[PDB]
Design a protein around this ligand. Structure first.
Ligand code: QKE
Ligand code: NA
Ligand code: NA
Lengths: 12, 28, 259
């Protein structure tokens, strides 16, 4: 969880 | 690619990075 | 990367991060070789001993990055994978022989000051440059050390790490290890007698070992970070996939099958 969240369009 | 391996911020503007000379010097 | 330093901005614009969607995590390095093709190590995608067998939809590639953890708005480009190709004779059972894989991107990535492909070597460049003592450059976001004291020391970097390392004579590579070395591998690193240190480490897997040709002043990817025993141990060396030796498979995958 060290990682800043990614834009949602990529995680889709 | 025709322009492969040429970095926009270095080779493309004739700027060297801080340690590439170490590589060149090893190629004897 | 052990005993490296922070990369300069744009220093490694072919560097690619292999990123797991869920849980969101770094898996491996990789490199950009054209607007639609990314090169990495087979073991980053397939390693049955660790129950590792990733599918396309498990993964993103993030291109143009510098900071390890930040989302680099307006700079990085995050790409979804179209297809994974693993070398059919990749030997995960024994010694990671032919540790190489290609990933096709769903859409071409736009090039920028931060995103630019590396060259792959031809026979002549490989023959001239892959010589003991000649130095290449390894980059990645992997661990800074093999071990450290938890919540007291620091083991992971904020940003891309870089180290320059000399190619090592093949008998020295072979005598450093009990693992069977093949012509599809070379090893790199300083000897205990030499002054300097440095190595890849966990999380650097699949990233590029590059050399700058003194003939045409272009960067060529000679190696892929493949395996080591420990990280930066005295008398041990990092082992790299010999990219040129596998280039006919690379060409086949791209030219006849994928284009
Ligand atoms: N300790 C075994 C040694 C081994 C080598 C060949 C066949 C099985 C085991 C290793 O190296 N691996 C295990 C799978 C992934 C790979 C890895 O951890 N590679 C990262 C690394 C560090 C330095 C550089 Cl270069 O790459
Ligand atoms: Na040996
Ligand atoms: Na070493």
């Amino acid at each position: 969880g060290d990682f800043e969240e990614i834009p949602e369009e990529y995680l889709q | 690619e025709a322009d492969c391996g040429l970095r926009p911020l270095f080779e493309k503007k004739s700027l060297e990075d801080k340690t590439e000379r170490e590589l060149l010097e090893s190629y004897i | 990367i052990v005993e490296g330093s922070d990369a300069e901005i744009g220093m490694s614009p072919w560097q690619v991060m292999l990123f797991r969607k869920s849980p969101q995590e770094l898996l491996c390095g990789a490199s950009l070789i054209s607007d639609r093709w990314v090169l990495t190590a087979a073991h980053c995608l397939l390693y049955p001993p660790w129950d590792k067998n990733f599918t396309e939809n498990d993964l993103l590639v993030r291109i143009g990055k510098h900071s390890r953890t930040r989302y680099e708005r307006n700079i990085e480009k995050i790409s979804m994978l179209e297809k994974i190709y693993i070398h059919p004779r990749y030997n995960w059972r024994e010694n990671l022989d032919r540790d190489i894989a290609l990933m096709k991107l769903k859409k071409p990535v736009a090039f920028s000051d931060y995103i630019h492909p590396v060259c792959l070597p031809d026979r002549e460049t490989a023959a001239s440059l892959l010589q003991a003592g000649y130095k290449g450059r390894v980059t990645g976001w992997g661990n800074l050390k093999e071990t450290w004291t938890a919540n007291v020391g620091k083991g992971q970097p904020s940003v891309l790490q870089v180290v320059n390392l000399p190619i090592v004579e093949r008998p020295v590579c072979k005598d450093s290890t009990r693992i069977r070395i093949t012509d599809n591998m070379f090893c790199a690193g300083y000897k205990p007698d030499e002054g300097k240190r440095g190595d890849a480490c966990e999380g650097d897997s699949g990233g590029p070992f590059v050399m700058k040709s003194p003939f045409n002043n272009r960067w060529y990817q000679m190696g892929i970070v493949s395996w080591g025993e420990g990280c930066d141990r005295d008398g041990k060396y990092g082992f790299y996939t010999h990219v040129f030796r596998l280039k006919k498979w690379i060409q086949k995958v791209i030219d006849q099958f994928g284009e």
